[PDB]
Write a protein that binds this DNA or RNA. Structure first.
Lengths: 138, 154
RNA sequence: UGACC
């Protein structure tokens, strides 16, 4: 059930770009203090984005290539949606002022007070452990 | 494909601008095109760059181009990654961490003093840097940082 | 030369 791995990956290019745009738009207005309706900005972005990419062949084209690739190579559905959600959440957070340094460290470590002491306890989470099994700079 | 991905990314920016700009007008709120254009552009450029997401799609577009030039190595890697038995578990843990983020000040103060976050050019993932002392200490278990050291580093 | 935050 992985015989569409390339097409699934290729769609995240369109979908993640779309999500980036919604975030950019809603976030900018928000930073201006202007009140707005999420669905309204969401719909306007989709209207413009869909018209340009989905009517100029640049989605039918990318997908077509992805399909040509999957045939040559020839479930995976769940891990692809989650891949897309990771891009979305990161961007949503990024837009709010919680950059990468904050996200990486907060996700890689848990920190505790330590009661009758003037120090903190740091522990690696599963994400940090996997990085070690891969690569962390000494 | 890479040029198409770039194209799609720019069309996305155009959409964010038209959405904000058209949203202000529909609500009877004045605005200068250049002003709104600039605001959306800083946010979009910052978001796409800081998220590592720009590198993700341009990177993905590049492995398709390669597969089109008969170098399926990367595409093969893409299928194996998505097929890994623990892929969903790993992304779920990833996604869960980020969603809980939507405090952390004290936590960041301590962390900002012991670790540095970097990025390998082109990559969407990150690189964490520390001292061999910390690394070896971490590669053993819990680690106590003294509130004095942190302060020694702002 | 994306693979994870």
């Amino acid at each position: 059930g992985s015989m569409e791995s390339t097409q699934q990956m290729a769609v995240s290019i369109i979908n993640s770009s779309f999500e980036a745009a919604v975030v950019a738009a809603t976030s900018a207005l928000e930073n201006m203090g202007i009140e707005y309706d999420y669905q309204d900005i969401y719909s306007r972005v989709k209207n413009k984005f869909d018209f340009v990419m989905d009517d100029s062949g640049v989605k039918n084209n990318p997908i077509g290539k992805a399909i040509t690739i999957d045939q040559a190579l020839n479930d995976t559905s769940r891990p692809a949606k989650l891949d897309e959600d990771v891009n979305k959440l990161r961007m949503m957070l990024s837009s709010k002022g919680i950059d990468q340094k904050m996200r990486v460290l907060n996700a890689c470590f848990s920190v505790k007070r330590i009661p009758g002491k003037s120090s903190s306890i740091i522990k690696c989470t599963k994400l940090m452990r996997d990085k070690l099994e891969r690569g962390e700079v000494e």
